[PDB]
Structures are given as C-alpha cells and as structure tokens.
Design a protein around this motif. Structure first.
Motif, mmCIF file in Angstrom:
data_model
loop_
_atom_site.group_PDB
_atom_site.id
_atom_site.type_symbol
_atom_site.label_atom_id
_atom_site.label_comp_id
_atom_site.label_asym_id
_atom_site.label_seq_id
_atom_site.Cartn_x
_atom_site.Cartn_y
_atom_site.Cartn_z
ATOM 1 N N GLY A 5 16.753 6.830 -1.949
ATOM 2 C CA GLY A 5 17.522 5.606 -1.808
ATOM 3 C C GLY A 5 17.466 4.971 -0.431
ATOM 4 O O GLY A 5 18.095 3.938 -0.199
ATOM 5 N N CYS A 6 16.716 5.581 0.482
ATOM 6 C CA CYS A 6 16.609 5.075 1.848
ATOM 7 C C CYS A 6 15.401 4.155 2.018
ATOM 8 O O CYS A 6 14.291 4.492 1.606
ATOM 9 N N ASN A 7 15.635 2.994 2.626
ATOM 10 C CA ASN A 7 14.573 2.036 2.927
ATOM 11 C C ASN A 7 13.811 1.597 1.682
ATOM 12 O O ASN A 7 12.621 1.290 1.751
ATOM 13 N N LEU A 8 14.499 1.559 0.546
ATOM 14 C CA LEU A 8 13.843 1.289 -0.727
ATOM 15 C C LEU A 8 13.322 -0.148 -0.847
ATOM 16 O O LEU A 8 12.216 -0.359 -1.343
ATOM 17 N N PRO A 9 14.111 -1.144 -0.402
ATOM 18 C CA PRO A 9 13.599 -2.517 -0.473
ATOM 19 C C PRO A 9 12.332 -2.711 0.358
ATOM 20 O O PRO A 9 11.391 -3.363 -0.093
ATOM 21 N N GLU A 10 12.318 -2.143 1.559
ATOM 22 C CA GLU A 10 11.163 -2.242 2.444
ATOM 23 C C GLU A 10 9.975 -1.471 1.874
ATOM 24 O O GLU A 10 8.829 -1.907 1.986
ATOM 25 N N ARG A 11 10.255 -0.324 1.264
ATOM 26 C CA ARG A 11 9.214 0.492 0.651
ATOM 27 C C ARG A 11 8.642 -0.199 -0.580
ATOM 28 O O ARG A 11 7.444 -0.114 -0.849
ATOM 29 N N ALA A 12 9.506 -0.883 -1.324
ATOM 30 C CA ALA A 12 9.076 -1.639 -2.493
ATOM 31 C C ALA A 12 8.115 -2.746 -2.075
ATOM 32 O O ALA A 12 7.118 -3.000 -2.749
ATOM 33 N N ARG A 13 8.420 -3.399 -0.957
ATOM 34 C CA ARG A 13 7.539 -4.421 -0.406
ATOM 35 C C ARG A 13 6.229 -3.797 0.059
ATOM 36 O O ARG A 13 5.179 -4.438 0.030
ATOM 37 N N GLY A 14 6.299 -2.541 0.487
ATOM 38 C CA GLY A 14 5.119 -1.819 0.924
ATOM 39 C C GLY A 14 4.171 -1.560 -0.230
ATOM 40 O O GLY A 14 2.969 -1.797 -0.123
ATOM 41 N N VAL A 15 4.719 -1.073 -1.340
ATOM 42 C CA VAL A 15 3.924 -0.776 -2.526
ATOM 43 C C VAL A 15 3.277 -2.042 -3.079
ATOM 44 O O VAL A 15 2.114 -2.029 -3.476
ATOM 45 N N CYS A 16 4.032 -3.136 -3.101
ATOM 46 C CA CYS A 16 3.524 -4.400 -3.622
ATOM 47 C C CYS A 16 2.399 -4.947 -2.750
ATOM 48 O O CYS A 16 1.457 -5.560 -3.254
ATOM 49 N N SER A 17 2.501 -4.729 -1.444
ATOM 50 C CA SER A 17 1.458 -5.151 -0.516
ATOM 51 C C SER A 17 0.171 -4.382 -0.790
ATOM 52 O O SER A 17 -0.925 -4.937 -0.716
ATOM 53 N N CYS A 18 0.313 -3.098 -1.104
ATOM 54 C CA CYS A 18 -0.834 -2.255 -1.422
ATOM 55 C C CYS A 18 -1.505 -2.717 -2.711
ATOM 56 O O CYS A 18 -2.728 -2.856 -2.766
ATOM 57 N N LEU A 19 -0.702 -2.954 -3.743
ATOM 58 C CA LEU A 19 -1.217 -3.414 -5.028
ATOM 59 C C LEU A 19 -1.903 -4.771 -4.894
ATOM 60 O O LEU A 19 -2.799 -5.102 -5.671
ATOM 61 N N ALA A 20 -1.476 -5.552 -3.908
ATOM 62 C CA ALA A 20 -2.030 -6.883 -3.693
ATOM 63 C C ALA A 20 -3.414 -6.810 -3.051
ATOM 64 O O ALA A 20 -4.275 -7.645 -3.320
ATOM 65 N N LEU A 21 -3.619 -5.807 -2.202
ATOM 66 C CA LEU A 21 -4.901 -5.617 -1.529
ATOM 67 C C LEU A 21 -6.004 -5.268 -2.519
ATOM 68 O O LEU A 21 -7.069 -5.889 -2.526
ATOM 69 N N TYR A 22 -5.744 -4.267 -3.353
ATOM 70 C CA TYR A 22 -6.744 -3.767 -4.286
ATOM 71 C C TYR A 22 -6.757 -4.585 -5.572
ATOM 72 O O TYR A 22 -7.802 -4.739 -6.205
ATOM 73 N N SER A 23 -5.592 -5.110 -5.944
ATOM 74 C CA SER A 23 -5.451 -5.932 -7.144
ATOM 75 C C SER A 23 -6.048 -5.249 -8.371
ATOM 76 O O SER A 23 -6.953 -5.789 -9.006
ATOM 77 N N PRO A 24 -5.544 -4.052 -8.706
ATOM 78 C CA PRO A 24 -6.059 -3.305 -9.857
ATOM 79 C C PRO A 24 -5.744 -3.979 -11.186
ATOM 80 O O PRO A 24 -4.817 -4.783 -11.267
ATOM 81 N N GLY A 84 9.038 3.061 9.882
ATOM 82 C CA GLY A 84 8.382 4.273 10.340
ATOM 83 C C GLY A 84 8.118 5.271 9.227
ATOM 84 O O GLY A 84 7.690 6.396 9.487
ATOM 85 N N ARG A 85 8.375 4.857 7.988
ATOM 86 C CA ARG A 85 8.156 5.709 6.823
ATOM 87 C C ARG A 85 7.081 5.120 5.919
ATOM 88 O O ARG A 85 6.765 3.933 6.007
ATOM 89 N N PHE A 86 6.523 5.956 5.050
ATOM 90 C CA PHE A 86 5.521 5.509 4.091
ATOM 91 C C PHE A 86 6.204 4.918 2.859
ATOM 92 O O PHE A 86 7.395 5.142 2.646
ATOM 93 N N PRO A 87 5.454 4.151 2.049
ATOM 94 C CA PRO A 87 6.012 3.568 0.822
ATOM 95 C C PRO A 87 6.605 4.613 -0.123
ATOM 96 O O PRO A 87 7.499 4.292 -0.906
ATOM 97 N N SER A 88 6.112 5.845 -0.046
ATOM 98 C CA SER A 88 6.605 6.921 -0.897
ATOM 99 C C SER A 88 6.198 8.288 -0.358
ATOM 100 O O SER A 88 5.315 8.392 0.493
ATOM 101 N N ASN A 89 6.848 9.334 -0.860
ATOM 102 C CA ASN A 89 6.512 10.700 -0.477
ATOM 103 C C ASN A 89 5.201 11.144 -1.121
ATOM 104 O O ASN A 89 4.577 12.109 -0.679
ATOM 105 N N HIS A 90 4.796 10.432 -2.169
ATOM 106 C CA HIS A 90 3.506 10.655 -2.815
ATOM 107 C C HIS A 90 2.466 9.666 -2.305
ATOM 108 O O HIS A 90 2.803 8.548 -1.912
ATOM 109 N N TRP A 91 1.203 10.083 -2.308
ATOM 110 C CA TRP A 91 0.099 9.152 -2.120
ATOM 111 C C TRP A 91 -0.238 8.534 -3.472
ATOM 112 O O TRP A 91 -0.075 9.178 -4.510
#
Length: 242
Positions: A15-34, A226-233
C-alpha cells in the motif's frame, strides 16, 4: 507476423507509494507497448488507474473485490471474443484462473493468467492449481494457440517432482535455452521494495506455429520515491506465429 506481451505481478498488496508505482508500471507498458499484458495482485483503485493511464488497453479482471489478476488487450490489435474464470475451489487466497479468448492478427489465441497459491507451506495447493492450469490448456482446440503467463509461485524445484510439464506444454524461458539475464523475476538483492523464478510462461501450439523470439526483464528503474514499480520484475516476451 509476431506478437508480444508482458506478465507482471505489480504487487497491489503493497500500500506504500502505490499511485506513483502505478504510474511507473504504465510508463513501462507505454515504452514496449505489448499486444497483451498479464497482471497479478491488481486491486480496484489500481485497476481504476489503468483505465485512465493505460487507455489503449481493454481491461479484463479476475475479480471485482480484494486483489486479483488482469489481462489487458491492445485495442485495434487484439480482438476480444469471450472470457472465462476457472475457480480454485480450495484456494485460501481468492486465487483463480482467468481465461480470455481473442483473435490477434489472423489467429485464435487463448490467453490465460493466474496467481498461484503463495508461501512454501501451501505447496500442495499450488501444485493442484498448476495441474488445473495445465489441464485447462489441453481443453483448448489444436487450432487455438494457448498462452499462459503469471505468478506461479513455484519454488524448491516443485515442478520436476510433480511430473514436469506435459510433452506439449513448453516453458518459454526453457525454450530460449534458459537465459540468465531474465532467470530470476523475484530478487531481494536487486529489488528493495521489500531468489526464485516465480513468474513463468507456458504455451501450447502446433510444432513451429509459435516460436519464442526473446525474453527480457522490465521495471528495473527506480522511481522518484526511490522504489521500484513492484517487488517483482516484469517479463517481456515476443513470439513469432506461422
């Protein structure tokens, strides 16, 4: 033609930094556009964020409450046909098997994802769930190309003791000669949001009609907090179809 997808446990239970992490994941999906994205540990407020920041994807959810998996489909690229949720009657963590039949390019696909039972103590349940997934992959027609991807929570060499994968079910990571640059999606040494190969890809298809071309890790850049989008890669995979 080719296809591409990303499987990723975005970890909504943190539950920590979830909005920012959500934006992180979306940025990643936007780069590769799977063409497809398999998500695990998605929660409603996180899901409502995908409907806005990942608007170019059709979202299908494994549940409406608690936490759940999800399958995103690239609009104009992937055509939805039908969905199905195979339950896990004995799950203690609301886990299940989300199935989404689609038409990508000119081929029928059966996209599947699941968040198998966590923890070492629930090994038996995790295996029985795995067998259900494998069994479900057999139920699909031969013309249909089945692709499973998600957090399998498989550890302690649990697979080889249960009999191993069926002859027609192939592991993408194994198919590519077991590359070490993307072997561990779970790593407490590299990641610090908080090693095994939890996130995996299973596929069934006619000989040669589905050939994995590449497999990479994603979400390896720290955010502003200072954290990653998730604990998983995440796992980016690209495959050819003939």
């Amino acid at each position: 033609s080719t296809i591409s997808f990303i499987t990723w446990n975005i970890d909504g239970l943190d539950g920590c930094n979830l909005p920012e992490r959500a934006r992180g994941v979306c940025s990643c999906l936007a780069l590769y556009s799977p063409d497809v994205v398999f998500l695990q540990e998605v929660i409603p407020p996180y899901c409502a964020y995908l409907k806005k920041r990942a608007a170019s994807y059709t979202i299908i959810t494994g549940n409406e409450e608690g936490y759940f998996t999800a399958i995103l489909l690239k609009k104009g690229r992937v055509k939805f046909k039908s969905q199905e949720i195979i339950p896990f009657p004995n799950t203690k963590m609301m886990r299940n098997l989300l199935c989404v039949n689609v038409s990508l390019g000119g081929n029928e696909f059966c996209l599947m994802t699941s968040h198998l039972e966590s923890t070492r103590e629930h090994s038996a349940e995790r295996i029985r769930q795995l067998k259900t997934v494998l069994g479900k992959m057999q139920e699909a027609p031969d013309s249909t190309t089945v692709i499973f991807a998600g957090d399998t929570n498989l550890r302690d060499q649990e697979v080889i003791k249960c009999g191993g994968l069926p002859d027609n079910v192939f592991d993408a990571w194994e198919f590519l000669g077991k590359p070490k640059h993307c072997q561990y999606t779970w790593d407490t040494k590299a990641n610090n949001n908080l090693k095994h190969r939890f996130d995996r890809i299973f596929f069934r298809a006619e000989e040669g009609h589905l050939i994995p071309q590449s497999l990479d890790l994603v979400g390896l850049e720290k955010l502003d907090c200072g954290r990653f989008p998730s604990n998983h890669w995440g796992l980016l995979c690209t495959l050819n179809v003939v």
